[PDB]
Amino acid sequence: MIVFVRFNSSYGFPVEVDSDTSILQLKEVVAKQQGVPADQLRVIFAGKELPNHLTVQNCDLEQQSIVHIVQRPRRR
């Protein structure tokens, strides 16, 4: 699958994932891109904040889903 990952942007970049990809691994893509620690990131999908240990097969993510990755803490 491709999942789109939107961080501090109007658009999400395409990420090749599979059924075994965890939310944590997904955060680490952004962590490494943006130089933010993964424990300061959160994944929001279709009004659910998804925890680190969930995998793609164990949540509602599917082909071409878009997730919004946000920073916590961050100055509002």
Side-chain angles (χ1 to χ4, degrees):
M1 277 141 287
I2 283 302
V3 159
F4 304 90
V5 168
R6 180 165 72 90
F7 175 79
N8 185 33
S9 177
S10 54
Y11 71 85
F13 65 79
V15 180
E16 188 81 27
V17 299
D18 72 20
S19 295
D20 294 351
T21 302
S22 68
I23 294 297
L24 178 52
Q25 288 167 342
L26 209 49
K27 288 178 194 193
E28 287 167 341
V29 176
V30 171
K32 79 76 178 65
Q33 214 191 57
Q34 297 292 318
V36 174
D39 66 4
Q40 306 178 203
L41 291 178
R42 306 290 184 276
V43 176
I44 310 169
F45 172 54
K48 286 182 290 280
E49 185 171 70
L50 307 182
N52 276 179
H53 296 151
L54 284 191
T55 62
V56 163
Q57 68 180 303
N58 283 345
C59 63
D60 286 327
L61 291 166
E62 55 178 35
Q63 178 54 7
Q64 332 261 12
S65 287
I66 173 132
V67 307
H68 189 197
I69 304 203
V70 298
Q71 187 169 188
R72 295 293 180 260
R74 59 173 279 286
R75 203 275 195 216
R76 202 78 204 155

XYZ file of all heavy atoms in Angstrom:
611
model
N 0.823 -1.222 0.000
C 0.000 0.000 0.000
C 0.852 1.265 0.000
O 2.022 1.259 0.415
C -0.814 0.028 1.292
C -2.111 -0.744 1.363
S -2.134 -1.475 3.087
C -0.909 -2.737 2.893
N 0.244 2.353 -0.461
C 0.748 3.732 -0.249
C -0.166 4.335 0.802
O -1.371 4.161 0.725
C 0.592 4.579 -1.502
C 1.665 4.212 -2.513
C 0.616 6.108 -1.208
C 3.148 4.359 -2.036
N 0.429 4.977 1.798
C -0.273 5.811 2.720
C 0.347 7.248 2.534
O 1.587 7.405 2.391
C -0.133 5.240 4.158
C -0.386 6.301 5.244
C -1.118 4.068 4.357
N -0.470 8.291 2.558
C 0.117 9.662 2.432
C 0.337 10.238 3.791
O -0.516 10.102 4.684
C -0.791 10.604 1.585
C -1.081 10.033 0.206
C -2.212 9.200 -0.014
C -0.195 10.256 -0.828
C -2.458 8.657 -1.299
C -0.420 9.690 -2.112
C -1.562 8.919 -2.330
N 1.495 10.868 3.967
C 1.877 11.376 5.278
C 1.994 12.926 5.222
O 2.876 13.460 4.568
C 3.149 10.641 5.809
C 3.771 11.353 7.075
C 2.825 9.132 6.056
N 1.088 13.625 5.909
C 1.055 15.087 5.940
C 1.591 15.609 7.257
O 0.970 15.375 8.303
C -0.374 15.603 5.740
C -0.504 17.120 5.755
C -1.842 17.606 5.190
N -2.943 17.313 6.109
C -3.366 18.134 7.085
N -2.759 19.292 7.285
N -4.401 17.786 7.863
N 2.708 16.287 7.215
C 3.296 16.903 8.441
C 3.581 18.388 8.141
O 4.375 18.690 7.207
C 4.624 16.230 8.800
C 5.347 16.896 9.975
C 4.979 16.665 11.270
C 6.400 17.774 9.746
C 5.665 17.299 12.339
C 7.049 18.413 10.787
C 6.671 18.166 12.083
N 2.993 19.282 8.915
C 3.251 20.757 8.736
C 3.142 21.165 7.211
O 4.025 21.816 6.651
C 4.642 21.073 9.360
C 4.986 22.540 9.361
O 4.111 23.413 9.498
N 6.294 22.836 9.202
N 2.077 20.713 6.534
C 2.007 20.881 5.122
C 0.581 20.807 4.781
O -0.211 20.254 5.569
C 2.757 19.740 4.450
O 2.666 19.827 3.045
N 0.245 21.338 3.596
C -1.113 21.242 3.010
C -1.287 19.894 2.337
O -2.399 19.474 2.050
C -1.349 22.383 1.969
O -0.312 22.401 0.964
N -0.173 19.185 2.114
C -0.242 17.861 1.451
C 0.646 16.705 2.060
O 1.675 16.931 2.722
C 0.069 18.077 -0.050
C 1.526 18.418 -0.302
C 2.484 17.366 -0.430
C 1.965 19.741 -0.336
C 3.793 17.603 -0.642
C 3.336 19.996 -0.556
C 4.230 18.898 -0.700
O 5.591 19.038 -0.913
N 0.218 15.482 1.832
C 0.906 14.328 2.341
C 1.777 13.677 1.288
O 1.371 13.586 0.132
N 2.994 13.306 1.683
C 3.897 12.540 0.826
C 3.649 11.030 0.861
O 3.149 10.501 1.860
C 5.355 12.938 1.108
C 5.857 12.596 2.511
C 6.248 11.309 2.849
C 5.929 13.592 3.483
C 6.740 11.036 4.168
C 6.413 13.323 4.783
C 6.801 12.097 5.121
N 3.885 10.331 -0.277
C 3.489 8.929 -0.370
C 4.535 8.029 0.291
O 5.760 8.138 0.057
C 3.394 8.691 -1.908
C 4.360 9.615 -2.468
C 4.246 10.854 -1.609
N 4.035 7.121 1.110
C 4.900 6.196 1.856
C 4.435 4.776 1.592
O 3.286 4.431 1.813
C 4.853 6.496 3.343
C 5.760 5.508 4.114
C 5.333 7.882 3.595
N 5.363 3.947 1.115
C 5.068 2.536 0.846
C 5.091 1.805 2.152
O 6.076 1.912 2.890
C 6.145 1.936 -0.026
C 5.665 0.538 -0.429
C 4.678 0.570 -1.600
O 4.725 1.519 -2.421
O 3.872 -0.367 -1.732
N 3.956 1.187 2.501
C 3.835 0.489 3.780
C 3.301 -0.891 3.453
O 2.985 -1.166 2.292
C 2.849 1.201 4.794
C 3.354 2.668 5.136
C 1.331 1.134 4.311
N 3.265 -1.776 4.441
C 2.507 -2.991 4.264
C 1.725 -3.342 5.511
O 1.744 -2.582 6.465
C 3.340 -4.196 3.699
C 4.300 -4.790 4.687
O 4.141 -4.604 5.913
O 5.250 -5.492 4.217
N 1.058 -4.515 5.521
C 0.215 -4.938 6.688
C 0.913 -4.998 8.019
O 0.286 -4.835 9.075
C -0.456 -6.311 6.418
O -1.375 -6.157 5.340
N 2.215 -5.218 8.000
C 3.025 -5.286 9.180
C 3.690 -3.991 9.656
O 4.355 -4.028 10.690
C 4.117 -6.385 9.074
C 3.525 -7.803 9.028
O 2.311 -7.934 9.249
O 4.270 -8.760 8.734
N 3.494 -2.867 8.964
C 4.099 -1.576 9.333
C 3.369 -1.074 10.545
O 2.164 -1.107 10.582
C 4.064 -0.585 8.154
O 4.769 -1.147 7.010
C 4.665 0.809 8.504
N 4.116 -0.646 11.554
C 3.540 -0.065 12.751
C 3.450 1.487 12.649
O 4.122 2.149 11.800
C 4.287 -0.473 13.970
O 5.553 0.124 13.933
N 2.684 2.061 13.570
C 2.472 3.499 13.612
C 3.818 4.113 14.034
O 4.239 5.135 13.513
C 1.330 3.811 14.609
C -0.017 3.227 14.065
C 1.328 5.284 15.002
C -0.509 3.795 12.786
N 4.502 3.438 14.928
C 5.793 3.898 15.330
C 6.753 4.032 14.146
O 7.410 5.038 13.999
C 6.393 3.028 16.421
C 7.804 3.394 16.896
C 7.888 4.888 17.289
C 8.207 2.506 18.044
N 6.812 3.032 13.283
C 7.724 3.090 12.146
C 7.344 4.251 11.214
O 8.191 4.903 10.657
C 7.663 1.774 11.378
C 8.325 0.633 12.154
C 8.021 -0.744 11.573
O 7.081 -0.921 10.798
N 8.840 -1.711 11.931
N 6.056 4.435 11.007
C 5.535 5.564 10.278
C 5.966 6.960 10.835
O 6.479 7.796 10.072
C 4.026 5.376 10.174
C 3.273 5.926 9.023
C 3.965 5.523 7.676
C 1.772 5.524 9.111
N 5.803 7.205 12.142
C 6.391 8.368 12.803
C 7.904 8.526 12.584
O 8.411 9.649 12.479
C 6.235 8.275 14.342
C 4.853 8.494 14.783
C 4.787 8.344 16.267
C 3.331 8.214 16.677
N 3.172 8.365 18.164
N 8.631 7.429 12.549
C 10.062 7.508 12.447
C 10.444 8.038 11.058
O 11.496 8.665 10.933
C 10.681 6.137 12.689
C 10.615 5.717 14.165
C 10.927 4.247 14.371
O 10.864 3.410 13.436
O 11.275 3.929 15.512
N 9.600 7.836 10.047
C 9.859 8.413 8.714
C 9.900 9.930 8.811
O 10.790 10.557 8.256
C 8.855 7.924 7.601
C 9.122 8.638 6.278
C 8.885 6.375 7.475
N 8.926 10.508 9.508
C 8.868 11.940 9.692
C 9.946 12.408 10.629
O 10.453 13.475 10.409
C 7.467 12.430 10.203
C 7.492 13.928 10.598
C 6.396 12.159 9.100
N 10.236 11.640 11.689
C 11.229 11.998 12.705
C 12.535 12.220 12.038
O 13.234 13.170 12.351
C 11.369 10.894 13.717
N 12.854 11.331 11.097
C 14.151 11.344 10.502
C 14.226 12.463 9.432
O 15.235 13.138 9.326
C 14.570 9.939 10.094
C 14.002 9.449 8.857
C 14.636 10.048 7.582
C 13.964 9.388 6.327
N 12.485 9.686 6.128
N 13.131 12.682 8.697
C 12.976 13.811 7.769
C 13.060 15.182 8.406
O 13.627 16.108 7.830
C 11.613 13.675 7.078
C 11.567 14.146 5.670
C 10.177 14.209 5.185
O 9.318 14.896 5.778
N 9.898 13.442 4.169
N 12.469 15.338 9.595
C 12.254 16.666 10.160
C 13.198 16.913 11.323
O 13.239 18.015 11.833
C 10.774 16.869 10.630
C 9.775 16.788 9.542
C 9.858 17.932 8.563
O 10.032 19.096 8.975
N 9.740 17.631 7.245
N 13.953 15.896 11.749
C 14.828 16.012 12.928
C 14.073 16.292 14.230
O 14.576 16.983 15.084
N 12.834 15.794 14.342
C 11.983 15.782 15.568
C 11.968 14.355 16.186
O 11.861 13.361 15.436
C 10.539 16.252 15.140
C 9.494 16.156 16.291
C 10.581 17.693 14.642
N 12.141 14.214 17.523
C 12.017 12.857 18.013
C 10.610 12.226 17.797
O 9.563 12.884 17.896
C 12.419 12.913 19.510
C 13.006 14.266 19.730
C 12.559 15.163 18.572
N 10.613 10.930 17.519
C 9.388 10.200 17.345
C 8.452 10.267 18.521
O 7.248 10.311 18.302
C 9.636 8.795 16.910
N 8.972 10.351 19.749
C 8.090 10.465 20.911
C 7.448 11.836 21.037
O 6.565 12.035 21.890
C 8.757 10.036 22.210
C 9.910 10.928 22.649
O 10.233 11.967 22.056
O 10.538 10.567 23.667
N 7.845 12.771 20.174
C 7.069 14.070 20.031
C 6.142 14.126 18.848
O 5.652 15.198 18.502
C 7.977 15.295 20.030
C 8.895 15.330 21.275
C 9.868 16.536 21.271
O 10.906 16.509 21.919
N 9.536 17.557 20.511
N 5.809 12.974 18.286
C 4.958 12.962 17.121
C 3.731 12.137 17.418
O 3.816 11.184 18.193
C 5.741 12.366 15.917
C 6.900 13.174 15.324
C 7.603 12.369 14.139
C 6.446 14.623 14.897
N 2.623 12.457 16.741
C 1.394 11.701 16.857
C 0.795 11.485 15.470
O 0.821 12.400 14.638
C 0.354 12.402 17.729
C 0.833 12.801 19.146
C 1.033 11.583 20.015
N 1.402 12.023 21.363
C 2.574 12.345 21.818
N 3.695 12.156 21.098
N 2.639 12.758 23.076
N 0.174 10.339 15.283
C -0.462 10.010 13.983
C -1.992 10.110 14.136
O -2.600 9.335 14.934
C -0.066 8.630 13.490
C -0.861 8.313 12.158
C 1.404 8.567 13.209
N -2.603 11.009 13.367
C -4.079 11.148 13.343
C -4.669 10.679 12.008
O -4.270 11.174 10.919
C -4.521 12.573 13.673
C -3.830 13.058 14.959
C -6.096 12.740 13.705
C -4.027 14.436 15.150
N -5.564 9.699 12.102
C -6.144 9.116 10.954
C -7.657 9.115 11.025
O -8.240 8.427 11.871
C -5.609 7.679 10.691
C -6.394 6.980 9.571
C -6.540 7.609 8.293
C -7.064 5.793 9.818
C -7.304 6.994 7.317
C -7.790 5.150 8.806
C -7.924 5.750 7.585
N -8.341 9.833 10.131
C -9.838 9.669 10.108
C -10.452 9.789 11.520
O -11.236 8.902 11.968
C -10.254 8.345 9.404
N -10.054 10.869 12.208
C -10.456 11.199 13.583
C -10.112 10.252 14.735
O -10.778 10.258 15.807
N -9.065 9.469 14.547
C -8.549 8.556 15.567
C -7.069 8.910 15.680
O -6.349 8.932 14.669
C -8.727 7.120 15.098
C -10.219 6.688 15.177
C -10.443 5.242 14.776
C -10.214 5.112 13.359
N -11.427 5.576 12.627
N -6.612 9.237 16.882
C -5.159 9.213 17.109
C -4.686 7.748 17.361
O -5.077 7.119 18.350
C -4.817 10.111 18.279
C -3.369 10.229 18.505
C -3.142 11.276 19.516
O -3.480 11.014 20.652
O -2.695 12.389 19.190
N -3.845 7.243 16.455
C -3.389 5.831 16.470
C -2.111 5.618 17.279
O -1.116 6.296 17.053
C -3.204 5.352 15.013
C -4.389 5.535 14.039
C -3.977 4.945 12.659
C -5.657 4.870 14.582
N -2.145 4.691 18.244
C -0.947 4.513 19.102
C 0.195 3.728 18.371
O -0.093 3.019 17.433
C -1.475 3.708 20.289
C -2.725 3.121 19.868
C -3.301 3.948 18.734
N 1.416 3.915 18.833
C 2.674 3.377 18.296
C 2.620 1.902 17.875
O 3.140 1.550 16.835
C 3.736 3.467 19.362
C 4.413 4.764 19.457
O 5.294 4.935 20.318
N 4.086 5.670 18.617
N 1.996 1.030 18.666
C 2.075 -0.412 18.397
C 1.075 -0.997 17.463
O 1.225 -2.143 17.037
C 2.226 -1.196 19.709
C 3.523 -0.844 20.394
N 3.713 -0.898 21.761
C 4.681 -0.341 19.870
C 4.934 -0.476 22.042
N 5.530 -0.105 20.915
N 0.093 -0.221 17.046
C -0.851 -0.674 16.056
C -0.124 -0.826 14.709
O 0.739 -0.005 14.336
C -2.007 0.295 15.841
C -3.146 0.413 16.834
C -4.276 1.263 16.167
C -3.693 -0.978 17.257
N -0.452 -1.902 14.028
C -0.022 -2.110 12.650
C -1.154 -1.825 11.667
O -2.321 -1.690 12.029
C 0.483 -3.583 12.451
O -0.604 -4.473 12.709
C 1.581 -3.848 13.397
N -0.789 -1.690 10.411
C -1.728 -1.411 9.374
C -2.871 -2.428 9.359
O -4.022 -2.026 9.222
C -0.976 -1.243 7.991
C -1.922 -1.346 6.776
C -0.301 0.077 7.917
N -2.568 -3.749 9.484
C -3.613 -4.787 9.397
C -4.600 -4.764 10.569
O -5.730 -5.281 10.428
C -3.036 -6.187 9.228
C -2.305 -6.711 10.388
C -1.780 -8.122 10.055
O -2.556 -9.018 9.715
N -0.476 -8.286 10.089
N -4.179 -4.115 11.664
C -4.897 -4.028 12.921
C -5.515 -2.674 13.103
O -5.886 -2.331 14.234
C -3.953 -4.259 14.095
C -3.609 -5.709 14.286
O -4.274 -6.594 13.725
N -2.528 -5.968 15.026
N -5.597 -1.861 12.063
C -6.392 -0.636 12.179
C -7.059 -0.371 10.847
O -6.919 -1.190 9.926
C -5.559 0.540 12.642
S -4.265 1.019 11.539
N -7.715 0.791 10.727
C -8.495 1.063 9.578
C -7.721 1.655 8.426
O -8.316 2.013 7.448
C -9.696 1.923 9.927
C -10.755 1.124 10.651
O -10.902 -0.098 10.351
O -11.394 1.733 11.543
N -6.397 1.729 8.525
C -5.623 2.274 7.387
C -5.757 1.347 6.211
O -5.697 0.145 6.368
C -4.125 2.463 7.733
C -3.717 3.521 8.716
C -2.280 3.320 9.165
C -3.905 4.895 7.961
N -5.849 1.906 5.016
C -5.925 1.135 3.784
C -5.149 1.812 2.636
O -4.424 2.779 2.848
C -7.391 0.885 3.435
C -8.200 2.091 3.340
C -9.632 1.771 2.937
O -10.144 0.728 3.356
O -10.214 2.590 2.235
N -5.224 1.245 1.446
C -4.599 1.821 0.281
C -5.053 3.296 0.148
O -6.228 3.584 0.115
C -4.977 1.005 -1.004
C -4.412 1.522 -2.350
C -2.858 1.724 -2.395
O -2.160 1.375 -1.482
N -2.346 2.316 -3.477
N -4.058 4.182 0.072
C -4.170 5.584 -0.175
C -4.789 6.359 0.949
O -5.192 7.435 0.697
C -4.985 5.995 -1.433
C -5.050 5.091 -2.571
C -4.103 5.461 -3.611
O -3.257 6.274 -3.383
N -4.178 4.818 -4.736
N -4.909 5.824 2.124
C -5.274 6.625 3.269
C -4.326 7.778 3.440
O -3.137 7.682 3.072
C -5.177 5.796 4.562
O -6.234 4.882 4.616
N -4.839 8.877 3.989
C -3.942 9.988 4.370
C -3.953 10.150 5.882
O -5.002 10.117 6.483
C -4.329 11.302 3.665
C -3.478 12.464 4.210
C -5.805 11.586 3.710
C -2.916 13.286 3.028
N -2.783 10.265 6.494
C -2.683 10.539 7.939
C -2.025 11.932 8.122
O -1.205 12.396 7.279
C -1.861 9.384 8.668
C -2.454 8.003 8.346
C -0.340 9.405 8.298
N -2.407 12.587 9.221
C -1.911 13.834 9.628
C -0.993 13.567 10.819
O -1.436 13.004 11.848
C -3.054 14.738 10.046
C -2.601 16.136 10.270
N -3.336 17.061 10.974
C -1.436 16.743 9.934
C -2.676 18.206 10.997
N -1.509 18.032 10.401
N 0.288 13.823 10.638
C 1.270 13.687 11.713
C 1.468 15.095 12.324
O 1.751 16.053 11.613
C 2.600 12.975 11.269
C 2.250 11.576 10.648
C 3.605 12.851 12.454
C 3.383 10.499 10.646
N 1.248 15.190 13.642
C 1.378 16.446 14.398
C 2.431 16.285 15.496
O 2.750 15.164 15.917
C 0.021 16.924 15.047
C -1.029 17.220 13.963
C -0.564 15.901 15.955
N 2.900 17.424 15.971
C 3.911 17.528 17.027
C 3.280 17.835 18.377
O 2.363 18.665 18.523
C 5.007 18.528 16.640
C 6.177 18.542 17.640
C 7.411 19.323 17.173
O 8.469 19.290 17.828
N 7.294 19.975 16.063
N 3.715 17.111 19.385
C 3.294 17.365 20.788
C 4.552 17.210 21.676
O 5.143 16.141 21.666
C 2.315 16.319 21.293
C 0.953 16.238 20.618
C 0.121 17.398 20.853
N -1.173 17.237 20.161
C -1.507 17.792 18.980
N -0.644 18.558 18.308
N -2.756 17.579 18.482
N 4.935 18.232 22.459
C 4.290 19.543 22.625
C 4.549 20.432 21.404
O 5.569 20.250 20.691
C 5.015 20.121 23.896
C 6.385 19.486 23.866
C 6.081 18.077 23.405
N 3.664 21.390 21.159
C 4.091 22.475 20.277
C 3.311 23.713 20.643
O 2.088 23.636 21.021
C 3.808 22.162 18.810
C 2.412 21.919 18.571
C 2.243 21.786 17.089
N 2.168 23.080 16.460
C 1.085 23.863 16.539
N 0.016 23.485 17.302
N 1.093 25.035 15.889
N 4.031 24.823 20.493
C 3.445 26.128 20.716
C 2.297 26.353 19.726
O 2.451 26.179 18.555
C 4.571 27.160 20.665
C 4.220 28.416 21.411
C 3.420 29.352 20.509
N 3.377 30.689 21.080
C 2.343 31.511 21.007
N 1.199 31.153 20.446
N 2.449 32.707 21.567
N 1.107 26.680 20.237
C -0.057 26.912 19.472
C 0.103 28.293 18.885
O 0.189 28.410 17.722
C -1.262 26.905 20.396
C -2.521 26.626 19.763
C -2.613 25.165 19.523
N -3.523 24.922 18.432
C -3.508 23.843 17.649
N -2.587 22.865 17.817
N -4.420 23.762 16.671
